[PDB]
Every structure is written in structure tokens, then in C-alpha cells.
């Protein structure tokens, strides 16, 4: 299926995923498309921060759901 991932700069990132995918897997897909290392990625859905070990299915992530990607990069 398709989920979208929006950044704070307004850009949107399309992802092909299965309900079986873990948040980790998703960050790995975002790294594939965008080169962003997973350890710098924070994903947010429905006002909740998503945790590495859980699946999209755990958060009710479905068709055309939109996730928000926020990066860390603090120095």
C-alpha cells in the first residue's frame, strides 16, 4: 500500500509499505529514498511518536495515511 511522509519544509515523501512493516523498516525505506539515517529520524502519527519495535498495524496506519517526519541533527 501507500503511505505518505511529510517533512517540516513542506515536502511529501511517498512510501510503498505493508501493514506488517515495523517503524524501523519504514525509517529504512525513508533512508533508501532520501539518504536520511534512521537514528536522525523521528516519525509522528496522530499526535504520537512512533517507537522502533512496533508495526504500522499497531498504530492504525492504513491507506494513504500521512506520517510526519522530523529530524534531530542537534549540534
Amino acid at each position: 500500500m501507500q503511505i505518505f511522509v511529510k517533512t517540516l519544509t513542506g515536502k511529501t515523501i511517498t512510501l510503498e509499505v505493508e501493514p506488517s512493516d515495523t517503524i524501523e523498516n519504514v525509517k529504512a525505506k525513508i533512508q533508501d529514498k532520501e539518504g536520511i539515517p534512521p537514528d536522525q529520524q523521528r516519525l509522528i502519527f496522530a499526535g504520537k511518536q512512533l517507537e522502533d519495535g512496533r508495526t504500522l498495524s499497531d498504530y492504525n496506519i492504513q491507506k494513504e495515511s500521512t506520517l510526519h517526519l522530523v529530524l534531530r541533527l542537534r549540534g
Binding site: 517533512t7 517540516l8 519544509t9 513542506g10 515536502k11 539518504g35 536520511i36 539515517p37 536522525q40 523521528r42 509522528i44 499526535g47 504520537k48 511518536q49 510526519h68 522530523v70 529530524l71 534531530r72 541533527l73 542537534r74 549540534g75
Partner: protein
């Protein structure tokens, strides 16, 4: 002409050189690096205030979940000189000053681009995991344009510089 570890020749000719321009290693280094690249003059307080104001004025976009702390709390927190700036600050400052900001990430050997689709002009800042510096061409030029012939070569050199620095023990 021998190149130092913090230098990388640009393109096949290597006539121009990309180099690290160090900024003050205080808790505001992100802001120092951006101010130098865009203004060629230091600024921290104005940049922190700009971020604080944008967050406060946009609670829907910069909600508690996005910020990882309450909106009002974040707005005060970023005003502290000890608070480290990150991607949230970069995005806001980039939008405000109409210049894209490209983060050259040493440990990842990748460039994280902010607003590359909005603004053709960009600066490069070097991130080692805990600290930011500026990248300059010929010890002066900091603002590049992605549609100028040499831009691809500049980005290639930035990535090769990042790789070399990762390999010589410079990332954290």
C-alpha cells in the same frame, strides 16, 4: 600546493577548493555556522528569537508531538544560549532567510537538504554529530546556486570531504 585534511578540490580541474570554516565551539554553533554562511556576520540571538516566534505563532504545525515537548515550552527553551539547535531550527531559518540549507553529515556521508525545492541558493554546513561548521569555496564563497554549472562538483566535493573526515576520526 598540498591539500589539508579539511580541504577538497572541486571537480576534475581542482582549481577551486572546498574547505571547513570553523566557528566558535559554544552551544550555539549551529547558529554561528548559518549566520556566517548567509550573512558573513555572526548572529545568534536574532536567529533564536526568530525560531521562538515561528514556533509560538504556528502551534498547529509545530505541535507538542512534532517538537517532542509542549509548544510554549519549546519556544522558551530555544531562547536559552545553552540549547542546541537542530533540524527544526534549520528548516525555520531557511524559510525565513530564503536560502536552502544543506547539512553535510559526516558520520552518514550524506547531505540532508532543507528547502532545496524552494530556493536555488544554498549554504553548506558540516555536521559531525555534536557540532556544526561552515563550508566555503576558496576560503570565502559560502552561498552557492544549484543551477550553476559547478554546483554538482561542489556537492560531490562536500561528500568526499565528509567521507575523508569520517575516515580520519572526525565524527561523533
Amino acid at each position: 600546493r598540498v591539500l589539508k585534511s579539511t580541504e577538497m578540490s572541486i571537480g576534475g580541474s581542482g582549481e577551486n577548493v572546498l574547505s571547513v570554516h570553523p566557528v566558535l565551539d559554544d552551544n550555539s554553533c549551529l547558529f554561528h555556522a548559518i549566520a556566517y554562511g548567509i550573512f558573513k556576520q555572526d548572529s545568534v540571538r536574532d536567529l533564536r528569537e526568530m525560531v521562538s516566534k515561528e514556533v509560538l505563532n504556528n502551534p498547529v504545525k509545530f505541535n507538542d508531538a512534532i517538537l517532542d515537548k509542549p509548544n510554549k515550552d519549546y519556544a522558551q527553551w530555544i531562547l536559552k544560549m545553552e540549547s542546541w539547535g537542530g533540524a527544526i531550527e534549520i528548516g525555520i531559518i531557511s524559510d525565513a532567510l530564503a536560502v536552502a540549507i544543506y547539512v553535510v553529515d559526516i558520520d552518514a556521508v550524506k547531505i540532508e537538504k532543507f528547502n532545496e525545492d524552494k530556493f536555488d541558493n544554498y549554504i553548506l554546513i558540516l555536521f559531525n554529530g555534536i557540532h556544526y561548521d561552515s563550508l566555503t569555496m576558496n576560503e570565502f564563497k559560502t552561498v552557492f546556486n544549484k543551477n550553476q554549472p559547478e554546483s554538482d562538483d561542489v556537492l560531490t566535493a562536500a561528500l568526499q570531504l565528509a567521507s575523508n573526515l569520517k575516515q580520519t576520526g572526525y565524527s561523533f
